[PDB]
Design a protein around this ligand. Structure first.
Ligand code: FES
Ligand code: FES
Lengths: 74, 74
């Protein structure tokens, strides 16, 4: 109780290591150049960023979070 | 120096409030149903999640991070 950190405005980064000389990491892709299916990372842990490589599973289990990727298909 | 938190494996959540009864938040969209352009949130702060609403600007300035959205267009 004395052990609980009260509700507060977040101070933690989401991205820790990806392209940190870019001050705002934006990606833009034309749907005609996409194949049948693209799986995009939303957790900033993928080694293949901006694509998902399953790293979100480790983030979620280690931090108790519930994030996952964005799928554009067809 | 005594003030610095050494390099360590992250313990902080990325998503703080979005759909927290879903244990892994995945979105999937068919490109034929997309219009000319979709801007997807990658920061988990948008009120219009999974779409970007510019909240990433506040996250970045408050935490010193550099994240931004994913654009699928054409
Ligand atoms: S690796 Fe980041 S959402 Fe899958
Ligand atoms: S609001 Fe999240 S990336 Fe823009």
């Amino acid at each position: 109780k004395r052990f609980y950190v009260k509700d507060h405005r977040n101070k933690a980064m989401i991205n820790l290591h990806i392209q940190k000389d870019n001050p705002k990491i934006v990606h833009a892709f034309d749907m005609e150049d996409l194949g049948d299916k693209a799986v995009y990372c939303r957790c900033w842990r993928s080694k293949k960023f901006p694509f998902c490589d399953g790293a979100h599973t480790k983030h979620n289990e280690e931090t108790g979070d519930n994030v996952g990727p964005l799928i554009i298909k067809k």
